[PDB]
């Protein structure tokens, strides 16, 4: 019983975290088969990061300027390529510990586990959600780049995120494992905006559902409302609009608890209009939107 | 940049999680060398759990009534012993993946990572704090028992917690790895109270310090106060008393930030007396006490 932000077990992923060094810059890479993936700004000096031409910078680099370390062992780089914002260093030895894996591009509102790494060594695990503005709210210091975000589905690690950047607001931006950024970000030391952060309404409603399943029911109201009317009030509060697909996703949760989605949307509406009056739901004095319906079900 | 509840990487611990079955009861065990550790109520039926005599129950059991599974492989139980509330099943094969490890008894206010397991298979990782009333606020369903709590210090896994029980309030109680409960709990299906839950004041102050380091400063006040006067107001709010050792622990954090402990205690005092006025610190509308000073430093 109880509900907590949980991350996937990190073991399969720890075995793929290497250290990549190019000159004075050192970052984490991800060693799957005979290929190492890291952020391409590893090939940058502090001067270059202001206005980098990555084709030109890399053309200057040769396989031997890239140091890949796995614990103590040194991998021999026999190839180098640039896919979008990601450098692919081909190496001699396939990773014996390559787990079964896939590269996925998650959509906004979905969550993933992050293994935060410094120097190719894991330091800690936490769960993040792709915000709607394509940022994440993590714990990344300098050296965390190349740290990866993943889901574990059965035996298969779905890699979805590699960390590249912190924004001026302190949020974090990164790419998929094909090197395409989430959001309108570029790997350059320039001022960049994520824009208006909005609340994943479907997740807040899964969370309210987790609360009811764990015994918190005070927020429940006898009123009900309409989808469009809920969305009318929601958009005022920069809440992402609910859809009938959203409703179908919350379906097995509205079933389990005997509370209809439109009944919950009315109870959420009162909480947005009337505040929380100093109470707490599931130990939070604010509304949580970093759990998906799937997250809640897997826990409950 | 940023502050998040982080758990240790779980890889060394995943490799020690086995499944223990005795009759119709199945639980998780922890396989270190030629010894498996699990909660002893594995030897109980649903009738026995009401008023169990564990000596008598186990005397009826023989090595062959205990099924230990590691993935598919079956370990052969060649020994059985009861240490406090923990059953030690001696086995034939030493665990090849035994990490370097130690058994520690944590003190209240300290935090640890939990790997939550079902059927000897890991499902997720989160960070917990030993509450002052010796309970924990986790996410444990039936079958989670024998799931373990740990810290990773250098190369060495310090096992500190094994889960046994949920209380009527929904909090969780368990033992150290020598089988001694944290708190006044017994492994019996009876109504049991943890008592008054109090707030780890030293942790809240480390958290306020993490907030300042990450840029949240609004709560900071020009006032200051005295230790004893702070403790006067604190005890009203069921906050654990601060001590000069506590102060020395928060020392490197009061140094880094240029704010004295007694200056922070005054700023905490205003927040207890004047509320938070609807603002947020580090994304929370409540005061967080599940980070120790060490946790904050390791992250920052
Ligand atoms: C990668 O290791 C590092 C991640 C990092 C750095 C500092 C704090 N937190 C972190 O997570 N990422 C960077 O250093 C990147 C470098 C590449 C070329 C994008 N740059 C920044 O993160 C950065 C640059 C910048 C300019 C102005 C405001 C903020 C800002 N952040
Ligand atoms: C161990 O797998 C299981 C853990 C569990 C069970 C249900 C919900 N959440 C959980 O974490 N622990 C138990 O089943 C134990 C059994 C032993 C003998 C202690 N019992 C309880 O957890 C329990 C018994 C009881 C009686 C009255 C109120 C509450 C209560 N909880």
UniProtKB/Swiss-Prot annotation, chains A, B:
Activity regulation (record text): Inhibited by pyridone-containing alpha-ketoamides compounds 13a and 13b. In turn, alpha-ketoamide 13b (tert-butyl (1-((S)-1-(((S)-4-(benzylamino)-3,4-dioxo-1-((S)-2-oxopyrrolidin-3-yl)butan-2-yl)amino)-3-cyclopropyl-1-oxopropan-2-yl)-2-oxo-1,2-dihydropyridin-3-yl)carbamate) inhibits SARS-CoV-2 replication in human lung cells. Inhibited ex vivo by michael acceptor inhibitor N3. Inhibited ex vivo by compound 11a and 11b.
Cross-link (Glycyl lysine isopeptide (Lys-Gly) (interchain with G-Cter in ubiquitin)): 5, 90
Impact reported for residue 132 to H: In strain: Omicron/BA.1, Omicron/BA.2, Omicron/BA.2.12.1, Omicron/BA.2.75, Omicron/BA.4, Omicron/BA.5, Omicron/BQ.1.1, Omicron/XBB.1.5, Omicron/EG.5.1
Residues the record marks as active site: 41 (for 3cl-pro activity), 145 (nucleophile)
Domain spans labelled Peptidase C30: 1-300
Subcellular location: Host cytoplasm; Host Golgi apparatus; Host nucleus
Mutation effect (residue 90 to R): In strain: Beta/B.1.351
Reaction(s) catalysed by this chain's protein: TSAVLQ-|-SGFRK-NH2 and SGVTFQ-|-GKFKK the two peptides corresponding to the two self-cleavage sites of the SARS 3C-like proteinase are the two most reactive peptide substrates. The enzyme exhibits a strong preference for substrates containing Gln at P1 position and Leu at P2 position
Cytoplasmic face residues: 1-300
Annotated phenotype, changing residue 142 to A: Does not affect ability to cleave and inactivate human TRMT1
Function: Cleaves the C-terminus of replicase polyprotein at 11 sites. Recognizes substrates containing the core sequence [ILMVF]-Q-|-[SGACN]. Cleaves and inactivates human TRMT1, preventing tRNA guanine(26)-dimethylation of tRNAs. May cleave human NLRP1 in lung epithelial cells, thereby activating the NLRP1 inflammasome pathway. May cleave human GSDMD, triggering alternative GSDME-mediated epithelial cell death upon activation of the NLRP1 inflammasome, which may enhance the release interleukins 1B, 6, 16 and 18. Also able to bind an ADP-ribose-1''-phosphate (ADRP).
Subunit text: 3CL-PRO exists as monomer and homodimer. Only the homodimer shows catalytic activity. Interacts with host FBXO22; this interaction promotes the proteasomal degradation of nsp5.
Identification of the protein by name: 3C-like proteinase nsp5
Source species: Severe acute respiratory syndrome coronavirus 2 (2019-nCoV)
Gene: rep
Part of the whole protein covered: 3264 to 3563 of 7096
């Amino acid at each position: 019983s109880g509900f907590r932000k949980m991350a996937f077990p990190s073991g399969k992923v720890e075995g793929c975290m290497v250290q990549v060094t190019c000159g004075t810059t050192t970052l984490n890479g991800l060693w799957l088969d005979d290929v190492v993936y890291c952020p391409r700004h590893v090939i940058c000096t502090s001067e270059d990061m202001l206005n980098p031409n990555y084709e030109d910078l890399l053309i200057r680099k040769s396989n031997h300027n890239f140091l890949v370390q796995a614990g103590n062992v040194q991998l021999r780089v026999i190839g180098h390529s640039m896919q979008n914002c990601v450098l692919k260093l081909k190496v001699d030895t396939a990773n014996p510990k390559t787990p079964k894996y896939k590269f996925v591009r998650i959509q906004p509102g979905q969550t993933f586990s992050v293994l935060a790494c410094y120097n190719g060594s894991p330091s800690g695990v936490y769960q993040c959600a792709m915000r709607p503005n394509f940022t994440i709210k993590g714990s990344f210091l300098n050296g965390s780049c190349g740290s990866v975000g993943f889901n574990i589905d059965y035996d298969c690690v779905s890699f979805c995120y590699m960390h590249h950047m912190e924004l001026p607001t302190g949020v974090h931006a990164g790419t998929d494992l094909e090197g395409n950024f989430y959001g309108p970000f570029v790997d350059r030391q320039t001022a960049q905006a994520a824009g208006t952060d909005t609340t994943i309404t479907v997740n807040v409603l899964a969370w309210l559902y987790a609360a009811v399943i764990n015994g918190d029911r005070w927020f429940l109201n006898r009123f009900t409302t309409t989808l469009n009317d809920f969305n009318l009030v929601a958009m005022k509060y920069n809440y992402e609009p609910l859809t009938q697909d959203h409703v179908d996703i919350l379906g097995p949760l509205s079933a389990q608890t005997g509370i209809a989605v439109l009944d919950m949307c009315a109870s959420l509406k009162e909480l947005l209009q009337n505040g929380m009056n100093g109470r707490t739901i599931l130990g939070s004095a604010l509304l949580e939107d970093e759990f998906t319906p799937f997250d809640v079900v897997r826990q409950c």
